[PDB]
Amino acid sequence: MAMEMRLPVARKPLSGRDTKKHLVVPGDTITTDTGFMRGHGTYMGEEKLIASVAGSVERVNKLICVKALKTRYIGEVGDIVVGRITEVQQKRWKVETNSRLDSVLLLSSMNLAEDELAMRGFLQEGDLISAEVQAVFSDGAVSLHTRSLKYGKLGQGVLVQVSPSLVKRQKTHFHDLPCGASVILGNNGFIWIYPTPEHKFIANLEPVSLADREVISRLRNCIISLVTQRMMLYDTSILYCYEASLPHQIKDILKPEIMEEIVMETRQRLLEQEG
Amino acid sequence: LLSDQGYRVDGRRAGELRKIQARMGVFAQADGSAYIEQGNTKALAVVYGPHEIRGSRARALPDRALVNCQYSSATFSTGERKRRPHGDRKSCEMGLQLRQTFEAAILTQLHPRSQIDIYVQVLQADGGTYAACVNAATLAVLDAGIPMRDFVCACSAGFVDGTALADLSHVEEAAGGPQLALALLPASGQIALLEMDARLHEDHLERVLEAAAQAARDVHTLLDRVVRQHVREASILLG
Amino acid sequence: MLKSKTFLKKTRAGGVMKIVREHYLRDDIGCGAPGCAACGGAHEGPALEPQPQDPASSVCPQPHYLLPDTNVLLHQIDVLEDPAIRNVIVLQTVLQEVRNRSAPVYKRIRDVTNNQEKHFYTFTNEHHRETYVEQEQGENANDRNNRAIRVAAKWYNEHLKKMSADNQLQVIFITNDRRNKEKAIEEGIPAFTCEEYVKSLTANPELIDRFSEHLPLSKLQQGIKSGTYLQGTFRASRENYLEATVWIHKEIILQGLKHLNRAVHEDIVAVELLPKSQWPTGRVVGIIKRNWRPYCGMLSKSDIKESRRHLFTPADKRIPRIRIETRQASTLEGRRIIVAIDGWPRNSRYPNGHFVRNLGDVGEKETETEVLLLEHDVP
Amino acid sequence: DHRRIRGPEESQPPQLYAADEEEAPGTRDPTRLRPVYARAGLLSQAKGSAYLEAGGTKVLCAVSGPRQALRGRLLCDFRRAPFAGRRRRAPPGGCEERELALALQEALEPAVRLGRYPRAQLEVSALLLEDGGSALAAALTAAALALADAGVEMYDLVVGCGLSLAPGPAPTWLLDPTRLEEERAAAGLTVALMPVLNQVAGLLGSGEGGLTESWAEAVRLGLEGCQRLYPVLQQSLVRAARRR
Amino acid sequence: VTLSEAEKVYIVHGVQEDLRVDGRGCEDYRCVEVETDVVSNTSGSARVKLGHTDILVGVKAEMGTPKLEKPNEGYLEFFVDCSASATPEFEGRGGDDLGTEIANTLYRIFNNKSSVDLKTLCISPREHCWVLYVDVLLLECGGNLFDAISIAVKAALFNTRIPRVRVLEDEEGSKDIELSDDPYDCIRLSVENVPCIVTLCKIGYRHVVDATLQEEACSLASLLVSVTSKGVVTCMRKVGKGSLDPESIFEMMETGKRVGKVLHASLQSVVHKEESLGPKRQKVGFL
Amino acid sequence: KETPLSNCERRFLLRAIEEKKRLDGRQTYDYRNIRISFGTDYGCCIVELGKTRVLGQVSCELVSPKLNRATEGILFFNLELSQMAAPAFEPGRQSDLLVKLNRLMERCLRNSKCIDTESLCVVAGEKVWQIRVDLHLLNHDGNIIDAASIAAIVALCHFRRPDVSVQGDEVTLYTPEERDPVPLSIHHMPICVSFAFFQQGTYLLVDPNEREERVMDGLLVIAMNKHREICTIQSSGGIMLLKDQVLRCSKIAGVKVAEITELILKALENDQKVRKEGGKFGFAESI
């Protein structure tokens, strides 16, 4: 039983950026070429396109928008999402994600009066669900639907909340790693980690074995370290973080120096196999 | 003695500001977090962003967002210990003016049925509290990415011996008497908020107002650098 | 560069509270002498007359400049107002210490400073980056001020030597204590006293110049019933305000502020007899009954246009001068007001009182009428 | 402030101005209990009530009935009477009363099962009429008996006893002290356990000086005291049920 | 309502086999950050940072009436502002509820008369004594809330510098008080008898030191033990909805005094490393 | 529970604003016809700004002074919204408008140094006058700011306090039967003028009534003086305005404070000439 205190280390700038992305702060003027449509994250002022959120700019052939760095989750059609149930209303559930409103899940989408009082039993207040996004309401509320049986109420696992602008828009988010743990990389800021089943819903409440648990908890701390050092989060990055985590024991990697060397080695590996 | 031979008590002339340093992204637990300091006045601002209404659901407006601002000073701010419960009158006003300035330019139009909360806590007050709180809240909002009209900057000004003074300390607000704080958005020159508690004569008024606005523009020429510097060292880590 | 200064001042509510102030250090403080080019040239403000015509050096110096200490500036102000002494540099620390010490000395220095012809340059030593000193722990404030003045004088010596083209302009330091002159020689700069310089300038005849306690009333009335202490009414005189009498119903003469234990005109006091060799002379040792009344008079303001404590001269000559604590202090000038006394602490020469009401300006009929009614107490 | 009749500005108690030397009460047996007089269902307009008396310590409790996963929440209010003790407290109080109310709430929830009360609440109101001794433990015991007679479902009763330490050179623990034995005291402790399930329901005791062994001995002695004290409460609640 | 029950049973099965969700052992703290003298308008200031949770404590000095119960020496006063900075759950009135309770516990921790030497605080008896206003302003609540407050108030009382005042008094009214210069001020408190709180929150058969928000939310009951430097144990408290079986109290009490020894020695070493290192140096950083 | 405004009310009133015509028929720069009435006893005034009644009362006592300020008297203001004034003014519901009026009145008539505080001190540190004024809003059909400022200034002008005589340490007050109560010392009369901004500062209006406040989006308050000094200004409503607008607004506010100071002086003279010849309440000019 040992405890450690330290003086708080002052942050260092740590510099070569090599970036030509064009950057705006709110209030300044976007360069107007005639034949732009409109954008989100900007507005019309005095017949001049004025950006409204600090960040970078993106230009499409017709669309000019401003991409920020930390927003809450925006409703998108084809995305998979993880959410937490808050209230049990009469015809629908209220699901909280990191969106600007609590998302709504109608009962007509859930694959299982006879429904009204039994609605409470098979989907408990406060569990964790994963679903595809059905559509978007008019005011910006997001509606989600469980189409296939790979969605549903989740297992026991562990959850980590991140910023939703730090994950790739890359297909097949469901990754079952060769380490022994499966992960759901939601398109919002949720990452779910659960042990892999061999049978291939019902709550399998048996205790998970120790090596499986320690692999699960090694992935979680690497995800925390990645989102702390502000890098993109995807499957090969998680694998190289696991490989870089293998020399050190699990408790010590939340010290910042071990985090620095893991992120540096992972970024070097990703860059050298990038091309 | 406040200004003799062009020099003030702090040792600075009539136009230049204090040294102000703003740091973004302190509390990763919250959504937007900023810490600013103007001389010895410390200000801390936290915004939890557009979250849905938790309780008392009749408060929601159908078209635009709702802005909730709460001002709380620390109990150990000045020499005399003051208590924030049962001392609410000064604070209630300081919250409602923040509500005014951030319903002014926050674009509530893009967020129907949405609650945006702005919490400002002051850690050490050395005069010019209101401007420091507005600047901290502006940096905190631009952390969390709520899209707004313009960068918002606030400052203060006084009038002593025929000369205008900018960015008063606690000493200069104590003995002097003419205070005038304003909040300004500089893209259009529109004064967002005025505060003045004085015995100031009409013929001087325009002069000090110009100096006040000039000080505000200097704040806009400093914090902008910080914001751009911050966002630049975001993008190098991303792409 | 930014530094921080710390004070531990008291309050008005009998309390002690900490103060931390910011303190900036600027680089663009000009030396005030056009011989330097690094400072810039001829600030529209007062200059120090570069290459001065010699007023009368003629014994010790080359053409030079004068830089005084605090005590010489408090004492030899009658020397320094004179139009022969022409080029003196004034430090800001000395001026602020004068502003703390004596009001009309500061007034006269300001009135000479705004006068252009006698060339004075005020130097902001507290904010110049070369000359700022911090307070070392274990050092009184007077020692810090003396060391700051010495360091700034050494800085002027080194700045007028090297930064100028050719070093032909000295600086001269004036003092009263010869030990301070010895310290100035030991650290650096040449120096002189006030008296030696004012003698050996040249051309003499233009410039030859240079509590008792109060016992509580129980012991007083015990001593009256038992013996030596005897009570009576107090009475001042319009002739000599050091002289006063006490009636006993026999009259007792008492003079001197040590014996006049700060009792106002019509009161009930208790006098102790002096020994008979020093005569019927007595001394006030206690105050039995205060009997005060609001007095008419005028408010003579100090030359500081910002201060709070002010001096009040009453109407009749029998009442000592009263120090009040107002903030108005400007519209009250030239108007007869009435002031009421509230107590006499041990520390001050004067009482403490307060404003009550305004009557009118001096010279109008109605004001003088109501004043002569209130003084002789006609209802 | 303006909803009660105001009087003088500032008042002082007479005991501080009183010039007398009050003697210590002397030596006693450590496990010397006070005689206990308890009866339940005393009040009429309340759903359940209990009155508990021990020497110089009096306490009364009453329970308002249930009113309109989901789980019941018993919020308990603890008021001391304004004339209990030497000094007179303010009628709102505000500092010490909420501190004792948290001890009550964190000691009663292991007793009252709340799965049988969806979306309802219970109001336990305790009132301390005479601060003769162990103040927290008698309030716990009377609130437990009042909740039992009120007819809410439980797992067990709650029996609590307070302790105290005489500040002599050999620190010897005392059981169920009087108010003078708290005034002389250095450190005082209070435990409460459900005797059937044999589990501690809440312990709160301020310290002045001790060592880890002594606190352990005090805890097990308090468990012995409450287990010892139980049957009088049993027979009193049986007689109160026989009145029904 | 804050987390599901399947993840509850996963956390408790992780607890019973010595690997929690971050990979710590049964009896291991995470990294603790202590910063001295942040706010420059106080007599003493401390900042304490544990994971997510943030506690800043400022201590001022004031003059006042000592008391009528204890006339000849001074006392301490506590106020906790559970601010609206932490959660929007407590925004306008909910903070004064929880911010009450913490404050009450601190009085018990300082109800010793052997905790801090109050005979130092006397100026002249029955007339004037010092009142240490200790104010706890937590910035963000992140779990295990009572440990960091105790670490912070110990660090802030170590940083406390009280100015040396002696009062002259005469036969008259005479309230003239000196406030001697040279802020040397060797009325620094002897902090070596000031206790620290350790929680021991119970999850299953095993008890866990330093629960997080998930690890508190999965737990039923908790023991609250305040330990001094040597072996001295001040007040104990049971906090929680659940019940607690008796032998677990003794086990958690011994584990609490062990963790208390480790904490106390390590805090003394770290704050002596602060004052040994460049009081004019280090450029104190709140960023 | 207040009645909501129609859409057609908004459209017709904005179309009326766009051609510079009010509802009642005055111009843009015209106050309504005001009336000042007095009570029986001293210091009781009723101000009608035109279907808007504000009651004003001044009471005064002897309180021990504040410790930092031993030599002047305390002013204490209370502007309380009565229940009869508006059907939505239930107690505790309208906190925002209550604070927004209360702090504005307090800042104006305190920090403007309108009435002397230094003339009040009887015995330094022991006995000082303490003035409490109470304004009750009785009927709500326009600016509460303007009518409240008028009522407070008229009540401060009309109030008289009982005489005290100081002799040594004796403080002997008198009944109003035994001595004439002296009037109070006033430096100047500061007053408030309200400006309404419509559709982002295009159209400037003076003195909006109820519908005219419901349709507006901007309010501005300028407090000025007889000698054309500006005391306080305050913006509300969340509008954006250029500085040219407030520069032209100060001039019109100066003309208006001159006219209302003329009205208050006629009011005081007419009431005093009424009370010289038998005693009554003195109406006042309604123009």
Side-chain angles (χ1 to χ4, degrees), chain B residues 80 89-90 195 200 202, chain F residues 68 102 107 228 230 250:
Chain B
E80 292 181 353
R89 172 163 300 185
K90 180 154 301 184
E195 281 287 327
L200 188 141
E202 189 191 6
Chain F
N68 289 321
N102 194 3
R107 289 190 301 165
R228 199 160 58 87
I230 300 171
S250 69

Side-chain angles (χ1 to χ4, degrees), chain B residues 23 27 29 35 37 42 44 46 48 70 73-81 85 117 119 121 123-125, chain E residues 39-42 52 54 56 60 62 79 83-88 92 96 133 135 137 139-140 286-287:
Chain B
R23 158 54 175 248
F27 304 102
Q29 184 64 256
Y35 165 71
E37 61 184 4
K42 270 70 183 301
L44 183 63
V46 174
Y48 284 100
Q70 180 179 1
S73 177
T75 61
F76 59 99
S77 175
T78 61
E80 292 181 353
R81 176 178 175 269
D117 49 350
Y119 295 103
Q121 179 152 344
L123 275 74
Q124 186 178 4
Chain E
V39 176
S40 295
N41 206 162
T42 69
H52 296 90
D54 184 1
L56 189 145
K60 293 197 290 182
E62 288 289 330
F79 180 75
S83 70
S85 301
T87 69
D96 288 331
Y133 283 152
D135 292 334
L137 183 63
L139 299 177
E140 181 66 30
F286 193 69
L287 301 174

Side-chain angles (χ1 to χ4, degrees), chain D residues 76 97-107, chain E residues 97 101 237:
Chain D
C76 61
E97 294 87 2
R98 292 187 182 95
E99 192 271 336
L100 293 174
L102 264 293
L104 285 172
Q105 184 179 1
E106 286 181 350
Chain E
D97 193 2
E101 176 182 1
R237 191 180 181 184

Side-chain angles (χ1 to χ4, degrees), chain B residues 80 89-90 92-93 97 99-100 104-105 185 189-192 195-200 202 206 209-210, chain F residues 68 96 102-103 107 188 228-243 250-251:
Chain B
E80 292 181 353
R89 172 163 300 185
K90 180 154 301 184
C92 275
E93 187 206 11
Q97 292 181 358
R99 182 184 294 175
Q100 175 180 356
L185 58 157
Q190 288 169 351
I191 292 96
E195 281 287 327
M196 182 263 285
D197 296 326
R199 201 183 176 182
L200 188 141
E202 189 191 6
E206 180 182 1
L209 190 62
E210 281 288 332
Chain F
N68 289 321
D96 297 331
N102 194 3
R103 185 69 179 171
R107 289 190 301 165
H188 63 280
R228 199 160 58 87
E229 296 173 351
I230 300 171
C231 291
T232 59
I233 58 173
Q234 183 176 2
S235 176
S236 67
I239 52 169
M240 296 176 185
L241 51 92
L242 296 175
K243 63 183 292 292
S250 69
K251 189 185 291 181

Side-chain angles (χ1 to χ4, degrees), chain B residues 119-190:
Chain B
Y119 295 103
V120 174
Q121 179 152 344
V122 159
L123 275 74
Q124 186 178 4
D126 199 359
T129 302
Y130 173 72
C133 294
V134 173
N135 292 317
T138 298
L139 292 174
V141 167
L142 292 175
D143 192 6
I146 300 169
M148 62 192 293
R149 283 186 179 91
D150 192 2
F151 205 86
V152 176
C153 294
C155 185
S156 297
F159 179 70
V160 174
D161 292 333
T163 60
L165 278 72
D167 196 4
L168 275 73
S169 70
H170 186 273
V171 186
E172 310 168 5
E173 285 185 353
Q179 301 176 2
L180 192 148
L182 88 167
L184 181 65
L185 58 157
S188 61
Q190 288 169 351

Side-chain angles (χ1 to χ4, degrees), chain E residues 26-88 90 92 94-99:
Chain E
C26 180
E27 296 177 354
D28 289 330
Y29 270 170
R30 63 262 190 99
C31 183
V32 174
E33 295 178 354
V34 174
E35 172 62 31
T36 189
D37 198 1
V38 174
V39 176
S40 295
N41 206 162
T42 69
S43 63
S45 297
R47 192 267 186 98
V48 161
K49 206 269 193 299
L50 272 75
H52 296 90
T53 188
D54 184 1
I55 285 92
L56 189 145
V57 172
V59 177
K60 293 197 290 182
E62 288 289 330
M63 287 182 179
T65 300
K67 263 181 181 179
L68 295 174
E69 297 292 328
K70 292 183 179 181
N72 54 1
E73 58 190 1
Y75 68 101
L76 275 75
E77 188 72 27
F78 289 103
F79 180 75
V80 172
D81 191 0
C82 185
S83 70
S85 301
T87 69
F90 38 87
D96 288 331
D97 193 2
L98 185 144

Side-chain angles (χ1 to χ4, degrees), chain A residues 13 15-19 21 23-28 38 41-43 50-56 67-72 99-102 139-140 161 165-166 229 231-232 267, chain B residues 23 28-32 48-51 53 107 110-115 142-151 187 220 224 227-239:
Chain A
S15 320
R17 25 103 154 321
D18 196 341
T19 194
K21 272 175 294 194
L23 280 72
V24 293
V25 293
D28 287 332
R38 202 255 185 275
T42 186
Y43 70 99
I50 302 169
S52 65
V53 58
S56 63
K67 183 178 184 292
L69 74 158
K70 288 177 95 290
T71 61
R72 301 186 72 89
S99 67
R100 60 183 179 271
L101 292 175
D102 46 352
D139 57 353
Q161 294 187 355
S165 69
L166 293 175
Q229 290 291 322
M231 195 174 178
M232 293 296 288
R267 185 174 295 168
Chain B
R23 158 54 175 248
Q29 184 64 256
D31 197 0
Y48 284 100
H51 72 288
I53 295 97
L107 273 76
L110 293 177
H111 296 87
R113 283 190 174 183
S114 302
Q115 181 179 2
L142 292 175
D143 192 6
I146 300 169
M148 62 192 293
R149 283 186 179 91
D150 192 2
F151 205 86
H220 181 72
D224 193 2
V227 174
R228 288 186 180 179
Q229 191 270 331
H230 179 270
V231 70
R232 184 176 293 171
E233 65 96 20
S235 293
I236 299 171
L237 295 176
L238 290 176

